[PDB]
Design a binder for this molecule. Structure first.
Ligand SMILES: [Zn+2]
Lengths: 290, 286, 204, 68
């Protein structure tokens, strides 16, 4: 019954946000927590939720799991409609990629002793950027089976070889002491719409007009800037007339480009003035005394 | 007041949605109630986490309702162990509007946080408004001689995210969110949304006035006071001085727009020059 | 095909010597099936039995199934041929071999299971292991392509409704195969409604 | 097919073979798409006579690759 490389770990939006927030808060500690979910089948590991375990003390490493805290949290979460078993643990790697150290391997051995299909999730809150979170899921490779000449898991599909392993993970024992499970995300329409409200500006400031004194001062300042920018733009055109093609970019290093700044100022003033005029014209119709 | 703005993080929204869904899996419920944890920054609330608490109420009677405050304290301790800087700042519920017993629940919560904030989080995806509506309990001293009671004063609510929380949200909104639209289009869409929101608010006021006129609701004598001020605030855009000032301002902005467009056209001609020269050089060497 | 079987075993031997992974092992098995498809010639499998034994779990399911590709169209005798290849009962890891045998039987009589549909239906009905049911579903669908037989459809729908991922994948594929081009409202409704209810991605 | 008809077993075999991405054994379905390239001469008894057709082209144009 060898594990399949097509196995996937499905992390919910709430779970992902919880681990990202906890990992960023605990930087640079390798703060850990438990992942509640359900082993749907031999190929799916759903992660419905997670909860963070408190840190015993100082030290940038994964501490031992507190059984009392885990039991209390599980028992109390079962009281409010969260009867999901622990499907593994997550812990943070603040900036050195996603992999497992020796301490992480020893910690994951405990979960694998409890549940053979437990998953150790590593999230890098430091290297994660908007639209791309650095995350990975791991499960230990048993030394006895691999040493004798057996693959850790069977490949019955291409699904397990779509993500090229990072060299940082490979150096730290990936595909030698542990293997990576492909991570997919479960997003529903409701949660996506709820998250869409982030940075959603209020209706009041849509019709709100900027202060006209500050608007005029900004317009005058930017136009005075474009004055010098065009004065330099003429010289830039003449210089680029007589300039070799090797200096098209090297000579632009360290010296401001009048064309780029002119474009930026034009875009800024067009947007600001057009928006202000349109908002004033809309307000002259909407808020009228008659 | 003691609260100027309440910032609700996306983690709170996701936790509230998950709590509502997992409780509603039973198939018989109306709303769910939980506790909000956050920090304090000047007079701006920073609601950043939440946890569900057991809660139930009677469908008919509003005075019959049970909230597990011992559960509240125990999970407050458990969360405080994880994050000591996140303290109880109020509570939440997913009921689409307020409830008559919300004041009693806020009184219960006020023991743990004296200036508790109730953030009604509508799970249903409203098209225009924010899912959060923040309120704080105040003692309304009426001038009609009626005895002072406890009411919910509204508080401006905003959705803001931590850096990692924003990173996660953008990862989850990678496909749905369209960032190709320029800033100008974004501002014009903001103006459209403001028009829609103003229309919705005016329609709500009109519906309330319609109910009052037919006697479905009594005359509040305070909403009418506010409405008289609202109608007085409507400016006269037909005044000669205002029209002249508006024309002068529009021309002042239009000359700037003209200068920007002229510079843009010249820069575009320069780009066309460079493109044609590059094409001619490429075809000459080949 | 058998008379003009001008296959080149040198290429197969040359690439078998370069095999170092299970993925390449099953790739070589499938390739050997391809270059000997319809030729009933299992020479490469015969002289490399000890290397073929390296296949484990679903690879076995593939390897046995490769037989059906090699013996495709060998309608003269296939139940006896498969029983010659595969013993009736075996304890250690024989579910994969039995499922692969049923799938290979379906492959031999692809689109022409005139009398093998009955045997495959009986085997699928009298099956307990999920791998055996997966292989039997694949074989039954392969042997009833476009026939739209109601008994096969009912048995395959029951297997699909068992809500097992391994069984469900083959059950859905064979449900589509048996009602190939029938555009029947009942089949579409059943399959789509199940796909909107099942929680196993293999079934989907 | 040679007459222009849509060979349903070929299409089905190719489509399910493309599903080898999710399931390796499904690659065997490609055997369905395998249409033999043959010209079979027959008689009134539906038997196979020793008939030698002529290909009006160089033998190397359409021939098996030379074994290594
Ligand atoms: Zn670690």
């Amino acid at each position: 019954p060898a594990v399949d490389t097509a196995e996937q770990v499905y992390i919910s939006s709430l779970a992902l946000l919880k681990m990202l927030k906890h990992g960023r808060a605990g930087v640079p500690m390798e703060v850990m927590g438990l992942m509640l979910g359900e082993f749907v089948d031999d190929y799916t590991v759903r992660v419905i939720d997670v909860f963070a375990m408190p840190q015993s003390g100082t030290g940038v490493s994964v501490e031992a799991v507190d059984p009392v805290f885990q039991a209390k949290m599980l028992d109390m979460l079962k009281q409010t409609g969260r009867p999901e078993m622990v499907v593994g643990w997550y812990h943070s790697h603040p900036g050195f990629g996603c992999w497992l150290s020796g301490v992480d391997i020893n910690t994951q051995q405990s979960f694998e002793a409890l549940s053979e299909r437990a998953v150790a999730v590593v999230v890098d809150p430091i290297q994660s950027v908007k639209g791309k979170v650095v995350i990975d899921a791991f499960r230990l490779i048993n030394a006895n089976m691999m040493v004798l000449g057996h693959e850790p898991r069977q490949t019955t599909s291409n699904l397990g070889h779509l993500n090229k392993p990072s060299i940082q993970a490979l150096i730290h024992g990936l595909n030698r002491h542990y293997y990576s499970i492909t991570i997919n995300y479960r997003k529903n329409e409701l949660e996506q719409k709820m998250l869409l409200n982030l940075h959603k500006k209020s209706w009041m400031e849509g019709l709100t007009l900027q202060d006209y004194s500050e608007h005029c001062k900004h317009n005058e300042s930017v136009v005075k800037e474009m004055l010098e920018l065009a004065k330099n733009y003429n010289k830039a055109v003449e210089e680029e007339d007589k300039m070799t093609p090797e200096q098209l970019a090297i000579k632009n290093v360290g010296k401001q480009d009048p064309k780029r700044h002119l474009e930026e100022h034009v875009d800024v003033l067009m947007t600001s003035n057009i928006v202000q005029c349109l908002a004033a014209m809309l307000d002259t119709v909407v808020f009228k005394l008659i | 007041l003691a609260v100027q703005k309440v910032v609700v993080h996306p983690l709170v929204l996701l936790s509230v949605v998950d709590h509502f869904n997992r409780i509603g899996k039973v198939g018989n419920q109306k709303r769910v109630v939980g506790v909000l944890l956050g920090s304090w920054q000047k007079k701006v609330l920073d609601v950043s986490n939440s946890f569900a608490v057991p809660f139930d109420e009677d469908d008919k009677d509003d005075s019959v309702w049970f909230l597990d405050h011992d559960y509240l304290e125990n999970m407050y301790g458990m969360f405080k162990k994880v994050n000591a800087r996140e303290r109880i700042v109020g509570w939440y519920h997913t009921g689409p509007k307020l409830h008559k017993n919300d004041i009693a629940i806020n009184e219960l919560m006020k023991r743990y946080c004296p200036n508790s904030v109730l953030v009604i989080i509508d799970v249903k995806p409203k098209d225009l408004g924010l899912p959060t509506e923040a309120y704080i309990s105040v003692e309304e001293v009426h001038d009609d001689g009626t005895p002072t009671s406890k009411t919910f004063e509204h508080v401006t609510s905003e959705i803001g995210a931590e850096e990692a929380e924003e990173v996660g949200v953008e990862h989850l909104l990678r496909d749905i969110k369209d960032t190709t639209v320029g800033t100008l289009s974004q501002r014009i869409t903001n103006q459209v949304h403001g028009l829609k929101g103003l229309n919705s608010k005016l329609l709500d006021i009109r519906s309330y006035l319609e109910k009052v006129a037919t006697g479905k609701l009594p005359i509040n004598h305070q909403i009418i006071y506010q409405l008289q001020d609202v109608f007085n605030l409507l400016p006269d855009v037909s005044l000669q001085e205002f029209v002249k000032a508006f024309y002068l301002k529009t021309n002042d902005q239009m000359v700037v727009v003209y200068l920007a467009s002229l510079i843009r056209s010249v820069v575009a001609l320069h780009n066309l020059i460079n493109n044609k020269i590059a094409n001619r050089d490429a075809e000459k060497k080949e | 095909l058998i008379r003009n079987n001008n296959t080149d075993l040198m290429i197969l031997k040359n690439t078998k010597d370069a095999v170092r992974n299970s993925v390449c092992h099953t790739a070589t098995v499938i390739a050997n099936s391809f270059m000997h498809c319809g030729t009933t010639s299992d020479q490469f499998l015969r002289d490399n039995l000890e290397w073929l034994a390296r296949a484990t779990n679903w690879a076995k399911f593939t390897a046995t199934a490769s037989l059906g590709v090699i013996h495709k169209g060998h309608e003269k005798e296939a139940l006896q041929l498969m029983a010659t290849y595969l013993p009736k009962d075996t304890s250690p890891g024989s579910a994969y071999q039995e499922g692969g045998g049923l799938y290979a039987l379906g492959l031999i009589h692809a689109n022409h299971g005139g009398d093998i549909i009955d045997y495959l239906l009986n085997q699928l009905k009298n099956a307990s292991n999920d791998i055996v049911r997966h292989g039997g579903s694949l074989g039954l669908g392969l042997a009833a392509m476009g026939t739209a037989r109601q008994d096969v459809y009912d048995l395959l729908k029951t297997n699909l409704y068992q809500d097992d991922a391994v069984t469900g994948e083959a059950a859905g594929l064979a449900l589509g195969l048996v009602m190939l081009g029938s555009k029947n409202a009942q089949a579409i409704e059943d399959m789509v409604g199940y796909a909107q209810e099942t929680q196993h991605e293999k079934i989907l | 097919s040679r007459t222009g008809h849509t060979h349903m077993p070929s299409v089905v075999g190719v489509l399910v073979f493309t599903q080898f991405w999710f399931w390796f054994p499904l690659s065997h379905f490609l055997s369905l798409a395998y249409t033999p390239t043959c010209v079979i001469g027959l008689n009134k008894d539906l038997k196979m006579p020793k008939v030698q057709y002529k290909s009006n082209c160089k033998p190397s144009t359409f021939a098996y690759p030379a074994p290594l």
